[PDB]
Structure 1
Amino acid sequence: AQYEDGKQYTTLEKPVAGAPQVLEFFSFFCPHCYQFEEVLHISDNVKKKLPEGVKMTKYHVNFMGGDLGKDLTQAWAVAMALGVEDKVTVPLFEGVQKTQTIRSASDIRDVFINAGIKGEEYDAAWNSFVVKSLVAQQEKAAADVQLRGVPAMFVNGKYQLNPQGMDTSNMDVFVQQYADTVKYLSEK
């Protein structure tokens, strides 16, 4: 074929029922995630090729950056609750990996403040039980597929993207191949 199991994707030996249709996992400590977000814009170019009717989900994971990782998972939950993902994603990445200015929950908070979410509103979200369940969701979905590495994408809880098995000479071509694969798997 042109799309082979084990080549552009792999299949989960035990499939995950009820899964979000397109499910992406990342960490702000994850270097490829940084590339995936800042240079490649994977999520974005995937959305542009997806069928209509497709919802896209993105979750943070705990297994990188220890105690700050868990904090970042709770903060990503706040972003999701407030719908401010597109306003904090880049400064979180650059604060963890470029400038090294995020070293505590308080430093994470500053990024939201400086992106214009109000202190009161952030702290309230931070502490809210809506946010607790969103954190639980992020952890559950990762658990369901036994996640051990990021970046990682899952389609319909059955298929897992395999970027190692695509051409990387040309970034633009990599992205197209990646997204087209998502679309193919989506139609499966």
Structure 2
Amino acid sequence: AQYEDGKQYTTLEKPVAGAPQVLEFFSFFCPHCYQFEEVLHISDNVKKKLPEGVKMTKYHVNFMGGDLGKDLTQAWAVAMALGVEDKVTVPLFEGVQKTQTIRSASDIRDVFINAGIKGEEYDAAWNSFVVKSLVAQQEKAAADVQLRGVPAMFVNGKYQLNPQGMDTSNMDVFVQQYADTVKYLSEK
């Protein structure tokens, strides 16, 4: 066929019931993730092609960057709780990988302060139980698919995107193939 298992995607041998429809995993320490967000804008282009009524979920992972990796999952929970993903995603990526000015939870916090979230508001969220369960969700979702690498994308808990089997000579074309594959998988 045109979309074949093991080519543009793989199938999970152990499907995950009740999983979010479109589930993306990343790490701020992850170089291809930097590309995916900053250069390719994958999340955004996928969204633009998803059918109506399909929600998109993005989670951070712990298994890169040790102690700071975990802080970044908690900060991403804070970002989700406050609804400020679109204001911190870029400075977090650049702070870890470009400028390398993010070395501690305090430096992570600085990014939110600069993005205009109030100290009081950031600290209250950081320490909230709502953020603790949002952290739990992120971990549980990664555990459910025994995730060992990022970037990763899963559709309906049963299919996993396989970007290795796509042409990367032209970046625009790669992105559209990626998005179209997610759309195909979505309607499956």
RMSD: 0.2
Distance 2:42 2:32 in 1: 11
Shift of 1:115: 0.1
Matched residue, 1:181? 181
The one-character-per-residue Cα deviations of 1:21-54 (angstroms, maximum 9, x if unpaired) are 0000000000000000000000000000000000
Shift of 1:109: 0.1
Shift of 1:114: 0.1
Number of residue pairs aligned between Structure 1 and Structure 2? 188
Shift of 1:155: 0.1
TM-score using structure 1 length: 1.00
SS state of the match for residue 25, structure 1?
Answer: strand
Shift of 1:8: 0.1
The one-character-per-residue Cα deviations of 1:145-186 (angstroms, maximum 9, x if unpaired) are 000000000000000000000000000000000000000000
Distance 1:57 1:37 in 2: 14
SS state of the match for residue 167, structure 2?
Answer: coil
Shift of 1:89: 0.1
The one-character-per-residue Cα deviations of 1:53-80 (angstroms, maximum 9, x if unpaired) are 0000000000000000000000000000
The one-character-per-residue Cα deviations of 1:109-152 (angstroms, maximum 9, x if unpaired) are 00000000000000000000000000000000000000000000
Distance 1:65 1:144 in 2: 21
Shift of 1:17: 0.3
Distance 2:38 2:149 in 1: 19
- Once superposed, which parts of structure 1, at least 4 consecutive aligned residues long, lie more than 4 Å away? none
How much identity, in percent, do the aligned residues show?
100
Q: Is 2:8 aligned against 1:11?
A: no
Residue correspondence of structure 1 range 102-113 to structure 2 within 5 A? 102-113=102-113
Distance 1:149 1:4 in 2: 22
TM-score using structure 2 length: 1.00
Shift of 1:85: 0.1
Distance 1:102 1:176 in 2: 32
